[PDB]
Structure 1
Amino acid sequence: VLRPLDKLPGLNTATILLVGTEDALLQQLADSMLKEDCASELKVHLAKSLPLPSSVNRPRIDLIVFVVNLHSKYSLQNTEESLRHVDASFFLGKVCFLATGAGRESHCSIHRHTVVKLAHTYQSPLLYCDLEVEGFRATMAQRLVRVLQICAGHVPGVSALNLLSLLR
């Protein structure tokens, strides 16, 4: 079970952990999220399911974006299954719900209300995008990285706790 403050922070390290069943798209999103030379260390983490095999030395994880591939109902059954292994103090600010495949709206095995209901019943931001195309990735990557500096505390005015008060 992941907790927000189980590890100590670094200096400029903002460790986000992507969550999605498909992993090539997660790798593409991670590549785009490090393409821009931002002012923060960006030890991006990938995964498939929140059990997250127990390996110590994992840094203080500052964001978990649940990439829910709307094209595949698996990406929700593997998110909702993985949503039960997140600490309740982790769901406040440091949780986003990416919904890739939205907008195509013809491959969607999942009605975007269902991801809306999931991201509202867990009280966390829900950021639509279409991760397959770099044009909508290289702008969602700069949205996840500015949410990153909010949850990791790099912007010295806004906490992760202040964040969800903005994205309600």
Structure 2
Amino acid sequence: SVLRPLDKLPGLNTATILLVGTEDALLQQLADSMLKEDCASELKVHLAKSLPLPSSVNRPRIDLIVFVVNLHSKYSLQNTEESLRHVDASFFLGKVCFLATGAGRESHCSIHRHTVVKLAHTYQSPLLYCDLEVEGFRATMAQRLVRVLQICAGHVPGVSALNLLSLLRSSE
């Protein structure tokens, strides 16, 4: 199955985000950090190891997808390259984001970050950096990601995902 951006009608004051990665503990911590605060909207977080998802009918529509990659592991990079082939091209227009973990400790790194830079540039999407094991750093990334989610869902007038594409575009 191929995931589609506008398959279902939106809910009332609701935003949904999907996190795809191999490390489950990091995903759980990130979801908790996102949900701890209070906001005007209603938030829902879905956790998955890879795509395609198991089939279900009650799934609400997905507004934003974040691919988190561990720089200390080749397995995570291979998993994300495999997952990237099951989402339709229409869904990359301002609704996909890449998150890279572990650049703080360079000695542990198995992946040269030229690789993730080139991957993000190839798929026309932003690339973010955060060390998710540190709670203080994770807290601010959760809020930035919540704001991006609110923009994508249509909860800020005058700004849409396609507009967000030009704001976050890199010069080279």
* 1:65-98 deviation line (CA, Å, top 9, x unaligned): 0011111111111001000011111111110001
Task: Give the deviation of 1:21 after TM superposition.
Answer: 0.8
Aligned to 1:56: 57
Task: Give the deviation of 1:102 after TM superposition.
Answer: 2.0
Aligned to 2:38: 37
* 1:106-141 deviation line (CA, Å, top 9, x unaligned): 222111111111111000111111111111110000
More helix per residue: 2
Aligned to 1:149: 150
* 1:7-39 deviation line (CA, Å, top 9, x unaligned): 221122110000111111001000001011111
CA separation in 2, counterparts of 1:82 and 1:96? 14
User: Normalising to structure 2: TM-score of the pair?
Assistant: 0.94
Change (3 A) 1:154 1:111: same
| 2:28 alignment partner, SS class | helix
More strand per residue: 2
CA separation in 2, counterparts of 1:10 and 1:100? 32
In terms of Rg, which structure is larger?
Answer: 2
| 1:14 alignment partner, SS class | strand
Task: Give the deviation of 1:46 after TM superposition.
Answer: 0.8
Task: Give the deviation of 1:57 after TM superposition.
Answer: 1.5
Task: Give the deviation of 1:43 after TM superposition.
Answer: 0.6
Number of matched residues?
Answer: 168
| 2:73 alignment partner, SS class | coil
- What aligned pairs does 1:56-135 form with structure 2 within 5 A after superposition? 56-135=57-136
- The share of aligned pairs that are identical, in percent, is 100
Structure 1 segments of 4+ aligned residues over 2 angstroms from their partners: none
| 2:136 alignment partner, SS class | helix
| 1:135 alignment partner, SS class | helix
| 1:81 alignment partner, SS class | helix
Q: Which runs of 5+ in 1 are unaligned?
A: none
User: Normalising to structure 1: TM-score of the pair?
Assistant: 0.96
CA separation in 1, counterparts of 2:36 and 2:23? 21
Q: Which runs of 5+ in 2 are unaligned?
A: none
When the two chains are superposed, the root-mean-square deviation of aligned CA atoms in Å is 1.0
CA separation in 1, counterparts of 2:16 and 2:148? 12
| 1:33 alignment partner, SS class | helix
